Amino acid sequence: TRPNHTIYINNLNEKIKKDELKKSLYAIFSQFGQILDILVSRSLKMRGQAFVIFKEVSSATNALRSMQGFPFYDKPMRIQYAKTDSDIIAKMKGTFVE
RNA sequence: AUACUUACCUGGCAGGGGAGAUACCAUGAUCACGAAGGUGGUUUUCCCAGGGCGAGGCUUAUCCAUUGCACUCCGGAUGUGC
């Protein structure tokens, strides 16, 4: 709930393959700012979710505001802030601890 | 039912993966203790020459469950071709 460099997106159609989904997520989410990375996994816990890491929290917040509910493969997108900083964020800040 | 002598009718020979290394067995080698090699084994490296074990791994659909906060690949089962 507290703004973050990374946004977390879930409730995605699970049929889409990892590389396809990363590609289309990059395409969809670049409109709001420079994206450093999009992390997707299809494991049991992680399937259906992606982390988009933006350079600025303001871009993250605006992407959340705009895309909240966006029709995506016949499903409304659910977006939250990441609970924790993404490793590449934490290393740029020097906050990272194993 | 068997063997013996004769006539007639049928029919192609050799074999059992191959090349190296064998200190050890057999051949108990015809000259005052002896062969080597070779031949037939046992041991030991390969072109892998065919098979058995299908663990592991690759490609893609079906079924069940998951709303999951990860950043060292990886949910369970069935089918097709390797």
Curated annotation (Swiss-Prot):
Location within or outside the cell: Nucleus
Domain RRM: 5-84
Mutagenesis or variant effect for residue 47 to Q: Abolishes RNA binding
Quaternary organization: U1 snRNP is composed of the 7 core Sm proteins SNRPB, SNRPD1, SNRPD2, SNRPD3, SNRPE, SNRPF and SNRPG that assemble in a heptameric protein ring on the Sm site of the small nuclear RNA to form the core snRNP, and at least three U1 snRNP-specific proteins SNRNP70/U1-70K, SNRPA/U1-A and SNRPC/U1-C. Interacts with SFPQ; component of a snRNP-free complex with SFPQ. Interacts with IVNS1ABP (via BACK domain); the interaction is indirect.
Residue numbers carrying N6-acetyllysine: 55
Transmembrane intervals: none
Outcome of swapping residue 6 to V: Abolishes RNA binding
Family affiliation: Belongs to the RRM U1 A/B'' family.
Function: Component of the spliceosomal U1 snRNP, which is essential for recognition of the pre-mRNA 5' splice-site and the subsequent assembly of the spliceosome. U1 snRNP is the first snRNP to interact with pre-mRNA. This interaction is required for the subsequent binding of U2 snRNP and the U4/U6/U5 tri-snRNP. SNRPA binds stem loop II of U1 snRNA. In a snRNP-free form (SF-A) may be involved in coupled pre-mRNA splicing and polyadenylation process. May bind preferentially to the 5'-UGCAC-3' motif on RNAs.
Name of the protein described by the UniProt record: U1 small nuclear ribonucleoprotein A
Signal peptide: none
